[PDB]
Design an enzyme around this catalytic site. Structure first.
Site, PDB file in Angstrom:
ATOM      1  N   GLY A  11      79.315   8.023  14.423  1.00  0.00           N
ATOM      2  CA  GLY A  11      79.961   8.038  13.112  1.00  0.00           C
ATOM      3  C   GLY A  11      78.998   8.346  11.978  1.00  0.00           C
ATOM      4  CB  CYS A  65      81.544  -0.972  11.561  1.00  0.00           C
ATOM      5  SG  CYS A  65      82.375  -1.332   9.980  1.00  0.00           S
ATOM      6  CB  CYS A  94      72.347  -6.071  12.690  1.00  0.00           C
ATOM      7  SG  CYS A  94      73.495  -7.005  11.627  1.00  0.00           S
TER       8      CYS A  94
HETATM    9  N1  LIG Z   1      87.695  -0.077   3.061  1.00  0.00           N
HETATM   10  C1  LIG Z   1      87.519   0.706   4.236  1.00  0.00           C
HETATM   11  O1  LIG Z   1      87.593   1.943   4.161  1.00  0.00           O
HETATM   12  C2  LIG Z   1      87.278  -0.127   5.469  1.00  0.00           C
HETATM   13  C3  LIG Z   1      87.246  -1.503   5.423  1.00  0.00           C
HETATM   14  C4  LIG Z   1      86.988  -2.251   6.561  1.00  0.00           C
HETATM   15  C5  LIG Z   1      86.810  -1.535   7.735  1.00  0.00           C
HETATM   16  N2  LIG Z   1      86.861  -0.178   7.766  1.00  0.00           N
HETATM   17  C6  LIG Z   1      86.561   0.469   9.080  1.00  0.00           C
HETATM   18  O2  LIG Z   1      85.021   0.696   9.006  1.00  0.00           O
HETATM   19  C7  LIG Z   1      84.721   1.728   9.887  1.00  0.00           C
HETATM   20  C8  LIG Z   1      83.768   2.710   9.173  1.00  0.00           C
HETATM   21  O3  LIG Z   1      84.538   3.309   8.074  1.00  0.00           O
HETATM   22  P1  LIG Z   1      83.983   4.591   7.324  1.00  0.00           P
HETATM   23  O4  LIG Z   1      84.881   4.838   6.123  1.00  0.00           O
HETATM   24  O5  LIG Z   1      82.527   4.537   7.112  1.00  0.00           O
HETATM   25  O6  LIG Z   1      84.206   5.731   8.425  1.00  0.00           O
HETATM   26  P2  LIG Z   1      84.826   7.215   8.345  1.00  0.00           P
HETATM   27  O7  LIG Z   1      84.453   7.781   6.990  1.00  0.00           O
HETATM   28  O8  LIG Z   1      86.284   7.096   8.703  1.00  0.00           O
HETATM   29  O9  LIG Z   1      83.972   8.017   9.411  1.00  0.00           O
HETATM   30  C9  LIG Z   1      84.374   7.966  10.788  1.00  0.00           C
HETATM   31  C10 LIG Z   1      83.214   8.535  11.628  1.00  0.00           C
HETATM   32  O10 LIG Z   1      83.591   8.500  12.965  1.00  0.00           O
HETATM   33  C11 LIG Z   1      83.451   9.914  13.522  1.00  0.00           C
HETATM   34  N3  LIG Z   1      84.365  10.130  14.612  1.00  0.00           N
HETATM   35  C12 LIG Z   1      85.715   9.992  14.623  1.00  0.00           C
HETATM   36  N4  LIG Z   1      86.197  10.423  15.820  1.00  0.00           N
HETATM   37  C13 LIG Z   1      85.106  10.745  16.544  1.00  0.00           C
HETATM   38  C14 LIG Z   1      85.041  11.243  17.814  1.00  0.00           C
HETATM   39  N5  LIG Z   1      86.137  11.475  18.649  1.00  0.00           N
HETATM   40  N6  LIG Z   1      83.888  11.510  18.397  1.00  0.00           N
HETATM   41  C15 LIG Z   1      82.707  11.352  17.683  1.00  0.00           C
HETATM   42  N7  LIG Z   1      82.757  10.862  16.386  1.00  0.00           N
HETATM   43  C16 LIG Z   1      83.948  10.541  15.837  1.00  0.00           C
HETATM   44  C17 LIG Z   1      83.744  10.709  12.403  1.00  0.00           C
HETATM   45  O11 LIG Z   1      83.229  12.069  12.688  1.00  0.00           O
HETATM   46  P3  LIG Z   1      83.903  13.457  12.025  1.00  0.00           P
HETATM   47  O12 LIG Z   1      82.974  13.842  10.882  1.00  0.00           O
HETATM   48  O13 LIG Z   1      83.835  14.418  13.137  1.00  0.00           O
HETATM   49  O14 LIG Z   1      85.225  13.090  11.485  1.00  0.00           O
HETATM   50  C18 LIG Z   1      82.921  10.022  11.293  1.00  0.00           C
HETATM   51  O15 LIG Z   1      81.575  10.291  11.429  1.00  0.00           O
HETATM   52  C19 LIG Z   1      86.022   2.416  10.314  1.00  0.00           C
HETATM   53  O16 LIG Z   1      86.337   2.000  11.600  1.00  0.00           O
HETATM   54  C20 LIG Z   1      86.991   1.773   9.310  1.00  0.00           C
HETATM   55  O17 LIG Z   1      88.338   1.672   9.833  1.00  0.00           O
HETATM   56  C21 LIG Z   1      87.050   0.587   6.656  1.00  0.00           C
END
Ligand SMILES: NC(=O)c1ccc[n+]([C@@H]2O[C@H](COP(=O)([O-])OP(=O)(O)OC[C@H]3O[C@@H](n4cnc5c(N)ncnc54)[C@H](OP(=O)(O)O)[C@@H]3O)[C@@H](O)[C@H]2O)c1
Ligand SMILES: NC(=O)c1ccc[n+]([C@@H]2O[C@H](COP(=O)([O-])OP(=O)(O)OC[C@H]3O[C@@H](n4cnc5c(N)ncnc54)[C@H](OP(=O)(O)O)[C@@H]3O)[C@@H](O)[C@H]2O)c1
Ligand SMILES: O=C(O)c1cc(/N=N/c2ccc(S(=O)(=O)Nc3ccccn3)cc2)ccc1O
Ligand SMILES: O=C(O)c1cc(/N=N/c2ccc(S(=O)(=O)Nc3ccccn3)cc2)ccc1O
Lengths: 207, 206
Positions: free
Chosen positions: A11, A110, A189
């Protein structure tokens, strides 16, 4: 000498991943990333030490990314798509299998603070993603690896402070963490065992 | 109507293992069909009868169902991502064996995805869900006394015996511990109230 120096980040192209990668490179880590073919890292940004192009849903690609690392950070997600998915839980299954086969123990991954909530309180629009976080957390907890469950509240765009609160095994006193502070915590961590086997909720008041 | 002898299919799975342990501790005479006996625990509660075989082989199923009072089905496929008919073909063999041996009671686990809109199913779980739907139809059309158990996410929390069961719909919680689910499968052997219904066990764990 760095005890933890080679890390895989899953990610790394995402909101939290980009700043975690930047901070890790600045801190001297040798970073391997797995990126999907159509979504590489930006050109002007910090460069990792190694890039694997592939998909977390392919065990072979995850194996190539985990081999030879000291530790793994997991920041997988589905960007702004809230549809039903198993990419995080199946990705975690592949990461667990690879870590076992390659002798890597430390995984900092995460999910979300909704895993510390009354499930009846999760917003329905986020329930499909949260269901996969729940699946992913079960995979990582049952693996026996040294797993830090990072369960943040809303991820914002406020600064890196390093001054956030880390609440163990419960919800904390603020409802936000900046993406930069969340990435800082994922890296912190790597250098201590105190959070292993615990859920952690990082949060802060930006002022 | 008292049930003493049961067959469990899928006894080596995560729900199967605790269902088996609970059934042995409670006094049931349990027969299991397993493809590999080493996947059964060496210590603690052990089943009374072990048939080594495959649910896809009608003769192995027949040997497992013979002489039973009731059947518990906790079959599942490991990591099938694309069309699969193991569970529904297994259920066809189980039904044929139950009819041939006069066994009238089957309690079988599918999934709460059968209670929600199909667009809620993650794409990579569509194939297993489609075969759960096929298995459910096989069991409903059999005319046997059938309790359909449709659980949500199966967790690892300790047994409580305190969960909710919602009849022909969904309840207000989205997880059931594997232990509570196995406890519910066994409770379904002691009553007829769930026969012909779909059942949704769920609970709030802390
Ligand atoms: N307020 C919030 O937004 C919030 C709060 C609590 C928890 N969360 C959770 O925290 C986590 C991190 O969130 P974030 O906003 O930093 O993440 P994000 O912007 O949604 O980024 C997701 C990452 O995962 C990669 N990915 C997705 N599918 C993949 C695959 N099949 N194979 C390899 N890589 C893959 C994406 O790559 P690509 O560039 O190829 O898409 C990207 O690098 C997520 O799980 C989210 O649900 C979010
Ligand atoms: N994971 C969830 O949260 C969830 C939620 C709702 C519903 N479900 C569904 O609930 C049911 C039970 O799930 P579970 O996780 O407890 O199951 P599981 O751990 O995947 O176990 C599957 C059981 O079926 C056996 N099996 C598979 N193919 C067989 C075959 N050809 N012949 C004989 N036995 C065979 C397996 O034997 P081996 O040990 O030999 O492989 C194992 O004992 C499944 O149908 C599942 O899809 C799961
Ligand atoms: O896309 C999103 O917006 C998205 C958001 C996600 N989680 N967002 C969250 C998760 C938890 C919270 S929370 O701040 O309200 N948790 C709390 C609430 C009160 C006290 C202590 N903790 C707040 C937001 C999880 C996945 C996502 O995709
Ligand atoms: O709410 C949930 O999390 C929920 C989850 C459910 N999960 N069912 C399954 C069924 C099978 C598996 S599996 O690990 O054996 N195979 C898999 C797993 C992921 C993708 C494709 N195949 C994994 C999960 C079924 C109903 C639900 O309501």
């Amino acid at each position: 000498h760095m005890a933890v120096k080679k890390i895989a980040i899953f990610g790394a192209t995402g909101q939290t991943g980009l700043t975690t990668l930047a901070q890790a490179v600045q801190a001297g880590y040798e970073v391997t990333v797995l990126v999907r073919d159509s979504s590489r890292l930006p050109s002007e940004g910090p460069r990792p030490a190694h890039v694997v192009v592939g998909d977390v849903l392919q065990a072979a690609d995850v194996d190539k990314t985990v081999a030879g690392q000291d530790a793994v950070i997991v920041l997988l997600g589905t960007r702004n798509d809230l549809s039903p998915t198993t990419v995080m839980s199946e990705g975690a299954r592949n990461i667990v299998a690879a870590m076992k086969a390659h002798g890597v123990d430390k995984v900092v991954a995460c999910t979300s603070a909704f895993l510390l909530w009354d499930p009846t309180k999760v917003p329905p629009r986020l329930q499909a993603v949260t269901d996969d976080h729940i699946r992913m957390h079960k995979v990582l907890r049952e693996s026996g690896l040294k797993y830090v469950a990072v369960m943040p509240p809303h991820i914002g765009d406020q600064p890196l402070t390093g001054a956030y609160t880390v609440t163990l095994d419960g919800r904390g006193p603020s409802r936000v963490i900046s993406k930069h502070d969340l990435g800082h915590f994922m890296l912190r961590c790597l250098t201590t065992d105190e959070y292993d086997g615990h859920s952690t909720y990082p949060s802060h008041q930006y002022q």
